[PDB]
Amino acid sequence: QPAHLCFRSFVEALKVDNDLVEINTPIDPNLEAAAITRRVCETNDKAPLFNNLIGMKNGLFRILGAPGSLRKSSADRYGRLARHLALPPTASMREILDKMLSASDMPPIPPTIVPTGPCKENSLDDSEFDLTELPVPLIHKSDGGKYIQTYGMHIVQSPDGTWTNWSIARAMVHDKNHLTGLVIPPQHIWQIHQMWKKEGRSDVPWALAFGVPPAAIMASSMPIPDGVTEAGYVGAMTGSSLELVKCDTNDLYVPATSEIVLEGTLSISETGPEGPFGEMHGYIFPGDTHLGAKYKVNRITYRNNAIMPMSSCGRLTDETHTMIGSLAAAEIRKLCQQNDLPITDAFAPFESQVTWVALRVDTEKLRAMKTTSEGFRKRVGDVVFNHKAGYTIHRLVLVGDDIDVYEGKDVLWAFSTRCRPGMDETLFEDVRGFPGIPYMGHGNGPAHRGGKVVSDALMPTEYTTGRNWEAADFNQSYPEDLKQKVLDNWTKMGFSHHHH
Amino acid sequence: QPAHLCFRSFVEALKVDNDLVEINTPIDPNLEAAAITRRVCETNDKAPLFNNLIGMKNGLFRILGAPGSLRKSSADRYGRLARHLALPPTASMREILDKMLSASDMPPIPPTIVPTGPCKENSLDDSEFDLTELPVPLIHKSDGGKYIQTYGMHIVQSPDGTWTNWSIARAMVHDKNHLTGLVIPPQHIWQIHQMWKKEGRSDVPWALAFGVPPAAIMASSMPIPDGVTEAGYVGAMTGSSLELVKCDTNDLYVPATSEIVLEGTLSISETGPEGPFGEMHGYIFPGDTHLGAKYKVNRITYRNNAIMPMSSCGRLTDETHTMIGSLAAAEIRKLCQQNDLPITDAFAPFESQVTWVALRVDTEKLRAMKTTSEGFRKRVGDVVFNHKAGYTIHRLVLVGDDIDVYEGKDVLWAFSTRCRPGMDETLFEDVRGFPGIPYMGHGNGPAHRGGKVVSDALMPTEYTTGRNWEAADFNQSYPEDLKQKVLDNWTKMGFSHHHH
Ligand SMILES: Cc1cc2c3c(c1C)C(C)(C)CC=[N+]3c1c([nH]c(=O)[nH]c1=O)N2C[C@H](O)[C@H](O)[C@H](O)COP(=O)(O)O
Ligand SMILES: Cc1cc2c3c(c1C)C(C)(C)CC=[N+]3c1c([nH]c(=O)[nH]c1=O)N2C[C@H](O)[C@H](O)[C@H](O)COP(=O)(O)O
Ligand SMILES: O=C(O)C#Cc1ccccc1
Ligand SMILES: O=C(O)C#Cc1ccccc1
Ligand SMILES: O=C(O)C#Cc1ccccc1
Ligand SMILES: O=C(O)C#Cc1ccccc1
Ligand SMILES: O=C(O)C#Cc1ccccc1
Ligand SMILES: O=C(O)C#Cc1ccccc1
Ligand SMILES: [K+]
Ligand SMILES: [K+]
Ligand SMILES: [K+]
Ligand SMILES: [K+]
Ligand SMILES: [Mn+2]
Ligand SMILES: [Mn+2]
């Protein structure tokens, strides 16, 4: 099976790429596997595959860390991501995001039901597993539980059957047959849960599939629109219908090649302790347990020699940056264009801990609008901060065409030099806020509201007559023939490879 | 003579360090020398010494570019700066700034007058030079003149004789015997000029010395207090009295080993076209000529085989970042401590284009103050933004003890995650602003006023009971014995030198 359509194939692909380290000696899921993965993520090293995990029994389980993290070279920096999508390993971020957005103006390709698959190779009923006896990792020393779920896909369906959502949300082991996790507004798992809670008759049928097709986990991490079934969007994106098998204990469908599947229910009434967890912004607040949603597990099915993917998330750079930030930025780009705003590109700078999105403006189009900073900032912020795709983002930075928003140095330069604090900014206090940011949930104000800003790093003439500066840099402050002379004589004179 | 006390010796020191490229083939001062230097600065390469400059005659002049720019290795990143100060080349920024602040609580060591020096080896009277025939560089393609003065020291004295100021301010050739340049508030050259203009009797006696003692050019770039003679501060800092010779045509004193000295007057009445110039924030606005101050040159004296230092300034990283930003930050640290604020360290992040200063707070001391963010932000901003040392800085970022303010990634992390936009910030509109920042002088508001902010990246418990988080990083989220195990087994497992 192709790497983008089968996680087991993806793992081979990383090997083939010389992007995997197989660790065949015993590694402890209590902190060690996550510590190694954390080091990998902070240094852009090869992904670790833990083949000998202390506590693995009867095939459950191996761990792959850092599945969507960065490579060290600049030329294939995003190669792990490209390998989720059938793209060349040298693909740019623009290319990856465009691939993720491509299905937005295509007919869905609905999934194909098949009678079996590798995820049915083994099974454990309600009398044969205990989630506290599996080698579930403790990811951070202060975590409030063992987070089994950092890179699987939750599957829930509206009560009317019309929308089946696939999404990533964290969950930890509560007891032998339950998890607790985040189910929060405005996320689709929460929107669907509220539909079942209003109906009031039963718990939500649920499945959690780990080691799904890589193209599916990418869409699981993306804020595609309300009511859109991720499986058909992934089908359209890949050009192929995904093969799904029915769960044994409910009528949901899971990818045929899923490594591990939990089947059960998400309660409409019960909660349990959840967190704290070392989170995407880089922090854990020890002892901040809150109540989360509660999941009951009725059955486990799994591949022979099953592999559990794991995100050891925190400080830069991991899946919570590369995927959450970038995929939100992609959706925000589209949303702005659909609202007739002249945005060409969007990216969440890693330097901002993916709390900012930089929006590149087509300033020829802006000029034709004959508008002003205040008016344009308000328009952009109203579109983005009132939408679910803007949930995680607290600062939007508007920049002109000379800025490559995928280059954080250039975004920082523009922000620092082109946006006058206060005057060039509009604050938004009456929008949904993201509590996970420390200055929100542990800050001075309401955890769930406000704290957002549009920072306009467009210069005044960009709205009127055109850019009126040149950069004081080698590229712009010297003519072409001189530049080339310098470059051609560089090593000759005594001064000091793309791939590496 | 020691490298910190003699520019010619400094140039040898860079050679010895394998930090110099000598270019002995002809190089054009029209753009080429500056283009090479610009490339050096953007890539942290070796400093270029142009020994065969097209237009050099009778010893005037060679050029040294990038005298205070960065080296490529992390271990000696600031080594050029350290070589201005007799510090080991591996000196940290903290060590450099502490050296620069050390004279602040020492008695001055006034300079020693000597009868001659190398700067008297050659001379040109009022009938024998023409500044338009020297090989003055065109530094950026759109500059409004040839900027002779990018790394020399202006020398002016109060009318009462009590204060002799040394400072860097740009100047360009106006005609055969005049320069024009920036003389702007609140700078000391401007404060002294205003004293002479109020007296109304004569132009200001002036000298401009190029290739001065490196320790002197560093103090020239630092906002030491009003009324403090830089020569005695440098004397105290170095432990040695500087040797100075009298000018021939006036009674000012110049460093004995200066490479090139201009003697003349700074007018109290005349102005001429000045700029535009590719400036420290990374921009040039072509055609934005303004009127600047006007200098008359009466005499030139110079060393045999004189060398002119040059800053090819603009985008990161050059002297306008390493020296202006860092030295302002140093002075701001001291100023805050003298105002009883619990600041331990200050640095202007390069990523901010040196428009921010991050202030590290001793949070044990803060806790004892029993204050709040709003009150503390206001206090800090009132101290800094009302003082000359705060002139160039538009954003102050307050961070707690876990943040190394000399590491821009960590400052950015804290700012992005700990300061809630709007709520955690205080804007200052009734303070002097820095017009050079594009969003000031070419922006939407007054060029000279406001646009400043204090951004509080202290978390709430830092004011009360203490930090209440751990970072989600390898350092903080894993115990010591595990961390060391990981590190000790890193290369064994398959994963991947300080000097490099
Ligand atoms: C890549 C990724 C995405 C996580 C995520 C993680 C990763 C690795 C974790 C598991 C390591 C840490 C926390 N995660 C959560 C999360 N969204 C959320 O509601 N709760 C979460 O706990 N997300 C983001 C979420 O997947 C996106 O917001 C999707 O848009 C949600 O899908 P939906 O639009 O269908 O609701
Ligand atoms: C290192 C350095 C410092 C420049 C400088 C440059 C460099 C390389 C240039 C020449 C390349 C670009 C512009 N410069 C100017 C400047 N200050 C100023 O008033 N006008 C300037 O034109 N400065 C900053 C100035 O030297 C500091 O603000 C000092 O504190 C001034 O000394 P003072 O406190 O005695 O007034
Ligand atoms: O645990 C965390 O890092 C988280 C989270 C989250 C929640 C909603 C949307 C995106 C990320
Ligand atoms: O209660 C919510 O709405 C929430 C939340 C949350 C918690 C942790 C990380 C991200 C969001
Ligand atoms: O109810 C509140 O004020 C709260 C909260 C919140 C939610 C998630 C994470 C952190 C704080
Ligand atoms: O020409 C520029 O880059 C400049 C400048 C300046 C002026 C005052 C204080 C610091 C820098
Ligand atoms: O007119 C002033 O006060 C000024 C100024 C200035 C110009 C260029 C760069 C920095 C400051
Ligand atoms: O008088 C003004 O408004 C002005 C100005 C200014 C000064 C220096 C640089 C840019 C603008
Ligand atoms: K999704
Ligand atoms: K602006
Ligand atoms: K000075
Ligand atoms: K704060
Ligand atoms: Mn969805
Ligand atoms: Mn001074």
Locate the domains of chain B by residue range: 1-330, 331-459, 460-500
Token duo for residue A125: 């009923």
**Cβ atoms within 10 Å of A3's Cβ, excluding its own:** 23
Q: Which residues contact A135 (CB under 8 A, 6 or more apart)?
A: A29, A53, A54, A55, A56, A60, A61, A63
Closest CB to B469: pick one of A283, A439, A479: A283
Please report the residues numbered 11 through 40 in chain B whose beta carbons come closer than 8 angstroms to any beta carbon of chain A. 21-23, 31-32, 34-36, 38-40
Catalytic residue among B259, B279, B425, B462: B279
Which residues make beta-bridge pairs with B395? B356, B453
SS3 B67: coil
Burial B117-151 (b: 16+ CB within 10 A, else e): bbbbebebeeeebebeebbbbbbbbbbbbbbbbbb
CB contact under 8 A, B477 and A437: no
The dihedral of CA B121, B125, B129, B130: what is its sign?
A: positive
Q: Which long-range contacts (CB under 8 A, 24 or more apart) does B50-56 make?
A: B50/B23, B51/B22, B51/B23, B51/B24, B52/B23, B52/B24, B52/B25, B52/B26, B52/B27, B53/B26, B53/B27, B53/B29, B53/B135, B54/B26, B54/B27, B54/B28, B54/B29, B54/B30, B54/B135, B55/B29, B55/B133, B55/B134, B55/B135, B56/B135
How many CB pairs below 8 A link A and B? 286
As residues whose CB is below 5 A from the ion ligand 13, the structure lists A 165, 188
**DSSP of B344-364:** EEEE--GGGTT-EEEEEE-HH
Tell me how close the Cα of A489 comes to any Cα of chain B, in angstroms: 10
Closest CB to A35: pick one of B278, B422, B482: B482
Taking the centre of ligand 13 as the mean of its atom positions, its distance from the CA of residue B388, in whole angstroms, is 54
- For residues A398 and A450, give the distance between their C-alpha atoms in angstroms, rounded to a whole number: 19
B393 contacts B332 by C-beta, under 8 angstroms: yes
Taking the centre of ligand 3 as the mean of its atom positions, its distance from the CA of residue A324, in whole angstroms, is 8
Report yes or no: A477 at the B interface, CB cutoff 8 Å: yes
- For residues B76 and B92, give the distance between their C-alpha atoms in angstroms, rounded to a whole number: 8
A360 contacts A399 by C-beta, under 8 angstroms: yes
B84 contacts B215 by C-beta, under 8 angstroms: yes
- What does the angle CA A211 – CA A216 – CA A219 come to, to the nearest 5 degrees? 130
- For residues A68 and A317, give the distance between their C-alpha atoms in angstroms, rounded to a whole number: 10
Pocket test for ligand 1, best of A81, A147, A168, A274 (most atoms within 8 A of CB): A168
* The residue type at B340: D
- Secondary structure element (H or E) that encloses residue A268, with its range: strand A260-274
* The residue type at B500: H
Report yes or no: A459 at the B interface, CB cutoff 8 Å: yes
- For residues B227 and B213, give the distance between their C-alpha atoms in angstroms, rounded to a whole number: 21
B303 contacts B8 by C-beta, under 8 angstroms: yes
Candidates A17, A72, A21; CA nearest to A44 is A72
Candidates B261, B282, B318, B333; CA nearest to B104 is B333
B153 phi-psi bin (left φ>0, alpha ψ -120 to 50, beta other): beta
**Cβ atoms within 10 Å of A450's Cβ, excluding its own:** 22
Q: Strand B452-456 to strand B395-399: parallel, antiparallel, or no bridges (unpaired)?
A: parallel
Please, what is the end-to-end C-alpha distance for chain A in angstroms?
30
* The residue type at A427: L
B26 contacts B50 by C-beta, under 8 angstroms: no
Q: Strand B47-50 to strand B62-65: parallel, antiparallel, or no bridges (unpaired)?
A: antiparallel
Report yes or no: A281 at the B interface, CB cutoff 8 Å: yes
- For residues A160 and A361, give the distance between their C-alpha atoms in angstroms, rounded to a whole number: 41
- For residues B285 and A361, give the distance between their C-alpha atoms in angstroms, rounded to a whole number: 21
Which residues make beta-bridge pairs with B265? B205, B296
- For residues A189 and A165, give the distance between their C-alpha atoms in angstroms, rounded to a whole number: 7
B447 contacts B464 by C-beta, under 8 angstroms: no
A385 contacts A453 by C-beta, under 8 angstroms: no
**Which residues does chain B have within 8 Å of residue A468's beta carbon, measured at their own beta carbons?**
285-286, 442
Closest alpha carbon within chain B to A457: B439
- For residues B161 and B175, give the distance between their C-alpha atoms in angstroms, rounded to a whole number: 30
As residues whose CB is below 5 A from the ion ligand 12, the structure lists B 419, 424, 456
SS3 B290: strand
Burial A460-480 (b: 16+ CB within 10 A, else e): bbbbeeeebbbbbbbebbbee
Token duo for residue A484: 């080339």
- For residues B96 and B94, give the distance between their C-alpha atoms in angstroms, rounded to a whole number: 6
A435 contacts A447 by C-beta, under 8 angstroms: yes
Candidates B431, B416, B347; CA nearest to B78 is B347
- Secondary structure element (H or E) that encloses residue B466, with its range: none
Q: Which residue has the tokens 């903080």?
A: B476
Q: Which residues contact A426 (CB under 8 A, 6 or more apart)?
A: A374, A377, A378, A381, A453, A454
Q: Strand A356-361 to strand A343-347: parallel, antiparallel, or no bridges (unpaired)?
A: antiparallel
**Cβ atoms within 10 Å of A312's Cβ, excluding its own:** 31
The dihedral of CA A292, A297, A301, A306: what is its sign?
A: positive
- For residues A453 and B499, give the distance between their C-alpha atoms in angstroms, rounded to a whole number: 42
Closest CB to A140: pick one of B36, B425, B477: B477
- For residues A270 and A292, give the distance between their C-alpha atoms in angstroms, rounded to a whole number: 9
Candidates B283, B286, B263, B266; CA nearest to B209 is B263
C-alpha of A26 from chain center: 30
Token duo for residue A313: 């998330």
Residue A495, judged by CB atoms within 10 A of its CB (0-12, 13-18, 19+), counts as: middle
Torsion of CA A432, A438, A442, A443, to 10 degrees: -70
- For residues A197 and A486, give the distance between their C-alpha atoms in angstroms, rounded to a whole number: 69
**DSSP of A16-58:** HTT-EEEE-S-B-TBTHHHHHHHHHHHHT-PEEEESSBTT-BT
Report yes or no: B478 at the A interface, CB cutoff 8 Å: yes
Report yes or no: B141 at the A interface, CB cutoff 8 Å: yes
**What phi and psi, each to the nearest 5 degrees, are found at residue B396?**
-105, 130
Q: Strand B164-167 to strand B343-347: parallel, antiparallel, or no bridges (unpaired)?
A: unpaired
- For residues A126 and A265, give the distance between their C-alpha atoms in angstroms, rounded to a whole number: 13
Token duo for residue A300: 């486990």
How many C-alpha atoms does A474 have within 13 Å on its Cβ side? 20
**Which residues does chain B have within 8 Å of residue A482's beta carbon, measured at their own beta carbons?**
31-32, 35
Torsion of CA A178, A184, A188, A194, to 10 degrees: 80
- For residues B391 and B185, give the distance between their C-alpha atoms in angstroms, rounded to a whole number: 9
Binding residues of A for Mn(2+): 165, 188, 230
Distances in whole angstroms, Cα of residue A221 to Cα of each of A169, A230, A331, A336, B484: 9, 10, 11, 20, 34
The verdict on the CB of residue B355 being under 6 Å from ligand 6 is: no
A209 contacts A244 by C-beta, under 8 angstroms: no
**DSSP of A102-125:** GGGGS-----EE-S--GGGSEEE-
Please report the residues numbered 382 through 421 in chain A whose beta carbons come closer than 8 angstroms to any beta carbon of chain B. 394-395, 409, 412-413, 416-421
B51 contacts B27 by C-beta, under 8 angstroms: no
- For residues B361 and B456, give the distance between their C-alpha atoms in angstroms, rounded to a whole number: 11
Q: What crossing angle do the helices spanning A480-493 and B32-43 adopt, rounded to 10°?
A: 70
Maximum Cα–Cα distance for chain B, whole Å?
80
Token duo for residue B250: 């006036």
**Cβ atoms within 10 Å of B253's Cβ, excluding its own:** 22
SS3 A430: coil
- For residues A30 and A54, give the distance between their C-alpha atoms in angstroms, rounded to a whole number: 9
Which residues make beta-bridge pairs with A48? A21
CB contact under 8 A, B438 and A429: no
**DSSP of A370-397:** ---HHHHHHHHHHHHHTSGGGTT--EEE
How many C-alpha atoms does A449 have within 13 Å on its Cβ side? 4
Burial B381-391 (b: 16+ CB within 10 A, else e): bebbbebbbbb
**What phi and psi, each to the nearest 5 degrees, are found at residue A313?**
-90, 155
Q: Which residues contact B330 (CB under 8 A, 6 or more apart)?
A: B97, B100, B101, B222, B346
Closest CB to A395: pick one of B46, B421, B453: B421
- Mutation target vs A (from B30, B455, B469; most A CBs, 10 A cutoff): B469
Tell me how close the Cα of B226 comes to any Cα of chain A, in angstroms: 29
**Which residues does chain A have within 8 Å of residue B45's beta carbon, measured at their own beta carbons?**
495-496
**DSSP of B2-49:** -GGG-HHHHHHHHHHTT-EEEE-S-B-TBTHHHHHHHHHHHHT-PEEE
Active site residues of A: 279
The verdict on the CB of residue B275 being under 6 Å from ligand 8 is: no
* The residue type at A182: L
Distances in whole angstroms, Cα of residue A382 to Cα of each of A331, A341, A388: 15, 12, 12
Tell me how close the Cα of B99 comes to any Cα of chain A, in angstroms: 29
**DSSP of B295-346:** EEEEEEEE-TT-EEEE---SSSSSHHHHTHHHHHHHHHHHHHHHTT--EEEE
CB contact under 8 A, A473 and B40: no
Report yes or no: A443 at the B interface, CB cutoff 8 Å: yes
Distances in whole angstroms, Cα of residue B140 to Cα of each of A112, A489, B30, B175, B324: 63, 20, 9, 19, 20
Distances in whole angstroms, Cα of residue A74 to Cα of each of A17, A41, A269, A402, A497: 15, 15, 49, 21, 10
B17 contacts B79 by C-beta, under 8 angstroms: yes
Candidates B422, B419, B428, B349; CA nearest to B385 is B428
CB contact under 8 A, A142 and B470: yes
* The residue type at B337: Q
- For residues A115 and A257, give the distance between their C-alpha atoms in angstroms, rounded to a whole number: 12
Q: Which residues line ligand 7 (CB under 6 A)?
A: B 182, 184-185, 279, 435-436, 448
Q: Strand A243-246 to strand A253-255: parallel, antiparallel, or no bridges (unpaired)?
A: antiparallel
Q: Which residues line ligand 5 (CB under 6 A)?
A: A 435, 441, 447
Query: In sequence order, which ranges of A221-260 are alpha helices (DSSP H)?
Result: 230-238
Residue A202, judged by CB atoms within 10 A of its CB (0-12, 13-18, 19+), counts as: exposed
Taking the centre of ligand 8 as the mean of its atom positions, its distance from the CA of residue A472, in whole angstroms, is 19
Tell me how close the Cα of B95 comes to any Cα of chain A, in angstroms: 27
- For residues A314 and A277, give the distance between their C-alpha atoms in angstroms, rounded to a whole number: 9
A47 contacts A69 by C-beta, under 8 angstroms: yes
**Which residues does chain B have within 8 Å of residue A485's beta carbon, measured at their own beta carbons?**
32
- For residues A222 and A99, give the distance between their C-alpha atoms in angstroms, rounded to a whole number: 12
Q: Is B388 annotated as a binding residue?
A: yes
Token duo for residue A492: 């000759």
